[PDB]
Amino acid sequence: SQTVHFQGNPVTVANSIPQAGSKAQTFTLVAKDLSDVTLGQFAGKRKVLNIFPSIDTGVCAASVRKFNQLATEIDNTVVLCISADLPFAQSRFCGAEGLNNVITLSTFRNAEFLQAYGVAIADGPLKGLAARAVVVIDENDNVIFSQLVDEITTEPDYEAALAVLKA
Amino acid sequence: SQTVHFQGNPVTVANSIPQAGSKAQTFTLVAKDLSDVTLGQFAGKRKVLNIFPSIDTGVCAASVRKFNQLATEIDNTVVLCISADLPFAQSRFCGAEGLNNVITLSTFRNAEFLQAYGVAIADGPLKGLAARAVVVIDENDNVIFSQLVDEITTEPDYEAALAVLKA
Structure with a gap:
């Protein structure tokens, strides 16, 4: 298990996020029309897993869509915005609006994904959400880059993720 | 298992809804502030579990709020509006705001509830939602009244439920 912070308060996260070098575990998640989407449907593409506690927070942080846009301007890239929000709530997500190759996916019937990828919050009020x-x-x-963000409310190292994507 | 319908197509629902005469099983669900709520917190009251595939569909039928208000106009009655939507999404429901004793509750980290109450959609695109x-x-x-509604998009027999609460 891992430890992150929320409102600078400590939060346990199950297992261990996959490390660069390792083989990505297969998954099934759910798309905005309730169809099942698997990792294998993206065979041969580079994939960014962009994992959130919620994408239904009612605030549209500029940095979210900026990264999604920069990532999908790199050829042969898809960005998968993943959270525990139901598809009904993800359908209006602002970070995927107007961008091809940015897809929202829900974990609501695939909780094993959050365990397998070392991003299941195990305690406190956010228990059951993704880190x-x-x-x-x-x-x-x-896997060529991973980061479990130390403070859940702050930005990932987008610059570092984008550098790997290009290189 | 049980069979209901979604726009006329058959849908499997796990186990069996509790019948009149059944013992209500304890449960824990999650409130709008991410706190845990149990059946035992309503000791001494009558409780209506009003269970939905989603309360974030973008359409608020007037029959939903009407029932909730009529039910809670009966002395010593609480209405628990229950779905798999996260607490973030349950804010867009039209049927609880401004009605005392009508509370929204999420199953997102308590999937066992839907199994125990015979309401877990087991197949089709709605798998993982409540019937x-x-x-x-x-x-x-x-349990003094229950109904697993034949067509998931159509109203329950609210008249019968209200009658059991009066008598």
Whole structure:
């Protein structure tokens, strides 16, 4: 298990986020029309897993869409914005609005994803939600960047994620 | 299991909804402020579990709030509006705001509730959501009325539920 912070308060997160070098575990998640989406449907693309406690917070942080946009301007890249929000709530997400190759996916019937990817919050009020995390997977499903964000309300190292994506 | 319908197509619902005469099982669900709420916190009251596939569909039918208000106009009655939507989304529901004794509750980290109450959609695109159902529990924690609604988009027999609460 890992420790992150919320309102600078400590939060346990299950297991261990995948490390660069490792093979990405397969998953199934749910798209905005309630269809099932698997990692294998993105075979040969680079994938960013952009993992949030919620994407239904009612505030549209500029940094979210900025990263999503920069990431998908790199050829052969998809960004998967993942959270425990139901598809009904993700359908109006502002960070995917107006951007191709940015897809929202929900964990509501696939809780094993959050365990497998080391991002399941295990205690406190946010128990059951995902931690803030970014995971970059290459064309052959190898992890090439991961970060479990130390303060859930602050930005990931987008600059570092984008550098891996290009390089 | 049980079979209901969604826009006329058959939908499997796990286990069996509790029937009149059944003992109400304890449960824990999550409130709008991410706190845990249990059945035992309503000891001494009659409780109506008003169970929805989602309360964030973008459409608020007038029949929903009407029932909630009529029910809570009966002395010693609370209405628990229950769904898989996260607490973040349950703020867009039209049927609880401004009505005392009408409370929204989420199943998002208590999936066992939907199993125990025979309301877990087991197949199809709605898998993981609750079926539409009404369960009325009395002061002895006995179930005195229940209905697993045949067509998930259509109203329960609110008249029958209200009658059981009066008598």
